[PDB]
Amino acid sequence: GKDFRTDQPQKNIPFTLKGCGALDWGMQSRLSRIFNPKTGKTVMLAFDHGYFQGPTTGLERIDINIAPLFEHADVLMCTRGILRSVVPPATNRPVVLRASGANSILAELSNEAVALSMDDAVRLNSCAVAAQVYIGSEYEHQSIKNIIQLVDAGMKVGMPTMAVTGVVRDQRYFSLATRIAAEMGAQIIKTYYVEKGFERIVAGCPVPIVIAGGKKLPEREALEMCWQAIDQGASGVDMGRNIFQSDHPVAMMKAVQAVVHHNETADRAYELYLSE
Amino acid sequence: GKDFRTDQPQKNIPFTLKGCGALDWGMQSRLSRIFNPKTGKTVMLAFDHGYFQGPTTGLERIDINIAPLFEHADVLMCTRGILRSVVPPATNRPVVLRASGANSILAELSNEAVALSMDDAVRLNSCAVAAQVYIGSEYEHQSIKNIIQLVDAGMKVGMPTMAVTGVVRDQRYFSLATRIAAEMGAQIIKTYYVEKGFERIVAGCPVPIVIAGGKKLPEREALEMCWQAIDQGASGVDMGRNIFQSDHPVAMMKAVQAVVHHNETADRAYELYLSE
Amino acid sequence: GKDFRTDQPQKNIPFTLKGCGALDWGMQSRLSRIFNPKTGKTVMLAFDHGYFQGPTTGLERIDINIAPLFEHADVLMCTRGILRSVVPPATNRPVVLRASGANSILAELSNEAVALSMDDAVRLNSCAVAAQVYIGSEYEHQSIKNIIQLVDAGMKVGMPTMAVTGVVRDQRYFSLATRIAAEMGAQIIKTYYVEKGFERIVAGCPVPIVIAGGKKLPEREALEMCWQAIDQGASGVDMGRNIFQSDHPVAMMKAVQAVVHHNETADRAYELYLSE
Amino acid sequence: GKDFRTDQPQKNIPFTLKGCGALDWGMQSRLSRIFNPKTGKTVMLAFDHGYFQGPTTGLERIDINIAPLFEHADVLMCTRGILRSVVPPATNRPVVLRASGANSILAELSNEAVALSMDDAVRLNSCAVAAQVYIGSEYEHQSIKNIIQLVDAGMKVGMPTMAVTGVVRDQRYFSLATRIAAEMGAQIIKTYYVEKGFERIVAGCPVPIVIAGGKKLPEREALEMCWQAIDQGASGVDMGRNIFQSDHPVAMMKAVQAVVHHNETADRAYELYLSE
């Protein structure tokens, strides 16, 4: 009384996330916590800014101000320090750990080193680790070695690496920076939206691209930037300031979600925002 | 223009999952993928039976028969062989890996060894690893050593261990087996429901208890068993046969979820079942 | 304006704890958490019985029944499983970890293996690790290798090992067991009190000896036993049953303390007991 | 005849020490030796100044001058050289080890490297390790890397790291330095008290803050500084000069204790001081 269904042969189910179709199960599994498999996109809440800036505006009290936002994000991005101290583990939300540092606003910005061992990233149950690359800066070379080192250690263990292009802010520059990062082995690339040519940044990059929010904009313009980036091929957005510095952060996030996951237009999204 | 809210002191948020209030963030984060933080409970779909039994009834074709069930479970439990081969990583569901084996139905049941390295559990992004303890059996000693080994390795890396009490099936026996396992350091205990005294099994165990389904019962009796176990303090149920051997598995899961998470009565749950 | 006090030469302060005068700082510091430096003695509350016995009488609920006792003890002894789950780290009391197991009441008693790595002992901030030696039993050989292995690992790390003589219960037997253990390198020995010859067990053993409580006695007889052991040169007592199975455990501990640290007579101690 | 108390469910006891609610048992246990669990505060006696200064005033003879003070402190802070040579292990007091060095008063101050391996901190049974961060200095980068390194190694082992903000001495500067250090993962931060805005330093830092004494003040002014820091949210004080350079060091410590643990006013405390 057993049924092997020998008339229906077993068939592999393809993994579609851009450029991640030849990774081991664990790594694909981690990537699937970050990018929703249905939509292939992500809404990321970043609040790691303190790692070289100290208590920056809006992030003075993560425990009070930012904690109510966690549930509305797909994925959290922050440092192990903030994570252990004030992000309740019961939050049950994927985390990308900031894994570079040792710079500050008082010195050369690009002077970064790896700021956590893979050992501890694993211990914290990260989905990914993140480092800045600074093409064109004084410490460009070290910043790439940082990526190299994370990818080397990450491959032993199934942990994806995210390279973030730290900084002329034009297409040919980001194309350079994103492509080198990808070519060194980063599975995720975070960069900035650009008025013209962003399409080419995405096209020339073989792995998922996520955009950073940049400085605080009026809510409707920020939603336009999201709309454009998504429309032009970005795999998600990672806002900070544009969310945590808004007067209605929860509403903003709902709007961003509509744009990113549900193909909402910039306008409808803004009206969704206004209704909270 | 910064607000530190110095009139409101920072306060730690308690972690309430039974017996897991003193573990590191990463370990508490993995336990929070398994036990829903709101309810403190879990519905787990087990299908590792193949590890010593071969193609058992209902599990001849995981890829066809079981795959549509994944989305309805809180957590999956299986071996690394099934995981890589036929569980699509896009499933985006927590997994507990079977980490013991090297026995079969053709020999002494209790003759198990560790069947995967922690190295690989981490590579697969597990939430926990599971092994059998066989108190009272010929290879009792080795079976405990297996737990000791996994706990040792798991603590280096933030990986919870689940001890499963393999097998007179009464309260004093299970009290013995569960308590030894917990005492040796397992963070989760899986055991069987018992007609009388189950409350004591729960009370005498300092960490979360999940019950196994056992042999196929009529759906309404299975739901009674769940209800009783939950009512008497179990932190979750881990059915296999009672789900994948039912004629309406998806319906049975929804029913089990109502009992486990939503305080439904056995009867209401059965009616919920009947409406699919 | 500096004063080097060149007229008064620096002088080393001797460490007096029996046979521990040639250990490194860290190991001596850990031993000093256990044995009060003023008196050279310890009151230890043991509740690791579960490790091979399951929920034993008095230890069904450590969290309710035993937790109120912690503050009255010098040092706690238990398993890592109990420690992480139900001993609040805020207790701020030195712990000795049970580091052997994989035996049970349903099989050969002496069949023990090392039950925690030194790695995790250090992670838990233990003061010492304990294992049973079973001279005369079936698995005598393995049990001494257990001690050997912990002492080897403990010397790398400054962790003291306590050997426990598990079981004819006479002087010549305990002299054999305690001396072998010490000769292998254990820094602390736990054994049983004996009607006659106990003085010789102490004299023939070059390191501190602590006595186990044994089965429940009437409070006054238990206090006599302590009195005798301390009088005859024991460095402390480690009661379990005689404390946690008493009707007035807190009172019993205060009595035990008076005998052990303050040279109270058996009688006075019993009256001290009666006044709570 | 067993009582499981099935009518009273097990309940986790919360750990309240600011921002240390998600750490493993051993790390919480080490932190509880430092910060009294009742009050959440600490009085720390620091005498590590020798590490880059040689025999500084008051510390010419630790063995004579400082030894009688140990018993009145909650926790000792010094180097491993001092600890092994002249701190008697029988002192039975928690120690925080200075773990940075290789600078001196004859060269650039911020040129520090890690001065002891975690291996040896464990060997010494420390409760924490400490190192200087020098935001804004020439070797700022290396100094952060030192913290990173200690946290990485500390996490493997359950050892908390204390970052000390070495040095314009205003709020916005210490906010930067404390927050970066916390963000990199230090569990304890030691900084200086500031005339204005100290409240904000505390609020913006997600982990415990302890203040350094600074240069010798008249006893009553020193007690005012304590009172203010504690009142504004500091978790403790770590005096050196203000204690060991006073004419009545034991009296001063009792006064500091009254301020720190018992809510004494600056005035009462000074009168308490005067009465020895």
Ligand SMILES: O=C[C@H](O)[C@H](O)[C@H](O)COP(=O)(O)O
């Ligand atoms: O160095 C990167 C930034 O500080 C943030 O972590 C993020 O990547 C971009 O900033 P925002 O989210 O505010 O736009």
Ligand SMILES: O=C[C@H](O)[C@H](O)[C@H](O)COP(=O)(O)O
């Ligand atoms: O050895 C354990 C079993 O094979 C299953 O993995 C499970 O733990 C219990 O069986 P069932 O879910 O069918 O009740």
Ligand SMILES: O=C[C@H](O)[C@H](O)[C@H](O)COP(=O)(O)O
């Ligand atoms: O195997 C040793 C025992 O179980 C206890 O840990 C203790 O060493 C002696 O027992 P009791 O304290 O009850 O006398």
Ligand SMILES: O=C[C@H](O)[C@H](O)[C@H](O)COP(=O)(O)O
């Ligand atoms: O570099 C730090 C100092 O030398 C001391 O160790 C301490 O942290 C602060 O100095 P004081 O206790 O004298 O105020």
